[PDB]
Scaffold this active site. Structure first.
Site, PDB file in Angstrom:
ATOM      1  N   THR A 168      45.310 -18.483  42.760  1.00 52.42           N
ATOM      2  CA  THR A 168      45.259 -18.825  44.314  1.00 52.42           C
ATOM      3  C   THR A 168      46.261 -19.818  44.250  1.00 52.42           C
ATOM      4  O   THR A 168      46.354 -20.040  45.762  1.00 52.42           O
ATOM      5  CB  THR A 168      43.736 -19.078  44.582  1.00 52.42           C
ATOM      6  N   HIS A 220      71.503  -5.408  38.807  1.00 52.11           N
ATOM      7  CA  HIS A 220      70.312  -5.571  39.944  1.00 52.11           C
ATOM      8  C   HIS A 220      69.065  -4.675  39.507  1.00 52.11           C
ATOM      9  O   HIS A 220      68.064  -5.146  39.686  1.00 52.11           O
ATOM     10  CB  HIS A 220      70.926  -5.574  41.378  1.00 52.11           C
ATOM     11  N   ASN A 235      67.789 -10.385  52.960  1.00 56.76           N
ATOM     12  CA  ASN A 235      67.833 -12.033  52.803  1.00 56.76           C
ATOM     13  C   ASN A 235      68.943 -12.697  53.873  1.00 56.76           C
ATOM     14  O   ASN A 235      69.833 -13.196  53.687  1.00 56.76           O
ATOM     15  CB  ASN A 235      68.667 -12.200  51.700  1.00 56.76           C
ATOM     16  N   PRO A 278      57.742   0.736  59.815  1.00 54.29           N
ATOM     17  CA  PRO A 278      56.609   0.208  59.750  1.00 54.29           C
ATOM     18  C   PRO A 278      55.695   0.702  58.631  1.00 54.29           C
ATOM     19  O   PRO A 278      54.939   0.023  58.411  1.00 54.29           O
ATOM     20  CB  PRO A 278      56.179   0.605  61.176  1.00 54.29           C
ATOM     21  N   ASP A 326      55.064  -7.289  55.814  1.00 49.45           N
ATOM     22  CA  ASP A 326      53.393  -6.802  55.415  1.00 49.45           C
ATOM     23  C   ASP A 326      52.920  -7.985  54.527  1.00 49.45           C
ATOM     24  O   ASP A 326      51.998  -8.149  54.517  1.00 49.45           O
ATOM     25  CB  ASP A 326      53.221  -5.562  54.528  1.00 49.45           C
ATOM     26  N   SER A 330      65.049  -8.771  47.090  1.00 46.94           N
ATOM     27  CA  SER A 330      65.031  -7.643  45.920  1.00 46.94           C
ATOM     28  C   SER A 330      64.239  -8.181  44.921  1.00 46.94           C
ATOM     29  O   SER A 330      64.016  -7.010  44.191  1.00 46.94           O
ATOM     30  CB  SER A 330      66.335  -7.492  45.655  1.00 46.94           C
ATOM     31  N   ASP A 345      48.989 -19.764  52.449  1.00 47.92           N
ATOM     32  CA  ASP A 345      49.612 -20.449  51.276  1.00 47.92           C
ATOM     33  C   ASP A 345      50.914 -20.983  51.731  1.00 47.92           C
ATOM     34  O   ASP A 345      51.424 -21.738  50.899  1.00 47.92           O
ATOM     35  CB  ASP A 345      49.381 -19.939  49.916  1.00 47.92           C
TER      36      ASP A 345
HETATM   37 CA   LIG Z   1      54.477  -2.063  57.095  1.00 45.81          CA
HETATM   38 CA   LIG Z   2      45.801 -20.920  47.840  1.00 40.31          CA
HETATM   39 CA   LIG Z   3      67.708  -6.881  49.954  1.00 36.94          CA
END
Ligand SMILES: [Ca+2]
Ligand SMILES: [Ca+2]
Ligand SMILES: [Ca+2]
Ligand SMILES: [Ca+2]
Ligand SMILES: [Ca+2]
Length: 279
Positions: free
Chosen positions: A16, A69, A161, A175, A200, A224, A260
């Site tokens: 957490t 990558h 980025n 979406p 998201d 990435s 956070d």
């Molecule tokens: Ca989404």
């Molecule tokens: Ca936390």
């Molecule tokens: Ca990317």
């Protein structure tokens, strides 16, 4: 299970709080799930994949990852040391060339390939696709990511980025997939991370140690690198029967560490992928 001295991102997704060193995870570790890493390819021979990685498709002369990558992203999904889902099956789809670039038409073909190919694989706990790639807005690229998601694959895509609204990037702006922002080890939004309403979830994306080509490792930064944390976490949760491909992104958001992160622009989710592990 507890991996001591884990890469910070793995520690982060099982805590957490920031600044822990131990990755706590259920021993099932995504066993029985499949993750397609749609990227520059995977060096399947890397000892860190323990024989669980294989190239299944390339759109170039070789299926070899000549870049690193894809191998890095695959390592965050499912390598032994660097992976969220240490027992997942990784499948490489090389849509990016060895410079890390790929035409949209190829990336779309690679997404459609996964939607079909998954039907001839044994992935009893479900199928995830990790798309650590992106370019400018394309309705056709977003449509391909939407199809792959609709086909029953948990699609995780990099927010990008550009330190900009991900609305202008694809497949980030689709979406229906799980658009992943990057955070750093101090729970700041990664300085480069895209943001916006279409995000998201965040995952660790700054200074992520994983596998590299030539049987090596290195630390690199990007949405990435966040994306495969989320893809591996989806594989892990699907294996635990906690969620399904259709709902994993929502489940990850619902069970995320909330509030956070610092430097989250108003209207961007403040949600950090978390596995909620309890020994
Ligand atoms: Ca989404
Ligand atoms: Ca936390
Ligand atoms: Ca990317
Ligand atoms: Ca191949
Ligand atoms: Ca190439």
């Amino acid at each position: 299970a507890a991996q001591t001295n884990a890469p910070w991102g793995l520690a982060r997704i099982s805590s957490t709080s920031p600044g822990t060193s131990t990755y706590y995870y259920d021993e099932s570790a995504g066993q029985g799930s499949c993750v397609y890493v749609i990227d520059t390819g995977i060096e399947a021979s890397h000892p860190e994949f323990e024989g669980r990685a294989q190239m299944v498709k390339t759109y170039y002369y070789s299926s070899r990852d000549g870049n690193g990558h894809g191998t890095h992203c695959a390592g965050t999904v499912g390598s032994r040391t660097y992976g969220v889902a240490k027992k997942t099956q990784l499948f490489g789809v090389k849509v990016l060339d060895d410079n890390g670039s790929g035409q949209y038409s190829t990336i779309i073909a690679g997404m459609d390939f996964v939607a079909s190919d998954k039907n001839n694989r044994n992935c009893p706990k479900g199928v995830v696709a990790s798309l650590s790639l992106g370019g400018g807005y394309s309705s056709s690229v977003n449509s391909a990511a939407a199809r792959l998601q609709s086909s029953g694959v948990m699609v995780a895509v990099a927010a990008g980025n550009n330190n900009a609204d991900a609305r202008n990037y694809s497949p980030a702006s689709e979406p229906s997939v799980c658009t992943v922002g990057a955070s750093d080890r101090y729970d700041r939004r990664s300085s480069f991370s895209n943001y916006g309403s279409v995000l998201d979830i965040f995952g660790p994306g700054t200074s992520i140690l994983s596998t590299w080509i030539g049987g090596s490792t290195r630390s690199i930064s990007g949405t990435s690198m966040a994306t495969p944390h989320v893809a591996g976490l989806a594989a892990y949760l699907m294996t635990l029967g906690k969620t399904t491909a259709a709902s994993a992104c929502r489940y990850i958001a619902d069970t995320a560490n909330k509030g956070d992160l610092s430097n989250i622009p108003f209207g961007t989710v403040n949600l950090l992928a978390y596995n909620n592990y309890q020994a």
